[PDB]
Amino acid sequence: VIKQISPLMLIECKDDTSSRSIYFPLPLDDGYKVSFNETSNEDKVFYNGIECPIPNVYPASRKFFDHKTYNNYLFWCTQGNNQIKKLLSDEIWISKMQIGITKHVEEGEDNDKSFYKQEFLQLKKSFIYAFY
């Protein structure tokens, strides 16, 4: 009976529980302009041997792509009635590392080798998962 499942969504539920904000990962090109100048014979990238035009990139605010300041991969985004709201992944997900062992019950087992660390994630109080 299952026919169609939507991609899992990150939904924010506010105190005024009448509207929900859907959060998406920030596009990797956000805040930057990519042109691909086509004057030809200028410069061609070879991605593992395939022809491709050169990706001229500028911030949408010139200078070039400074990968020392590139941080779009750390941000999640949602629609606002203005610009795009950027939320850090830190502010959404809380992470803790848990140490675990199996208590050595003697008269048996070669299991001193039971020793591990696990990562557990907690969602912020206003954030839930959803899909259709």
Next chain:
RNA sequence: CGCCACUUCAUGGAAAUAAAUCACUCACGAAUGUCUU
């Protein structure tokens, strides 16, 4: 030469002062760094 006793019974000063006030050592050691379905 004889005769004969009274008076006085602790005041002042010092009443604690300096030195050391914790020292050295150990401040985590060994096992497990994944295992069984």
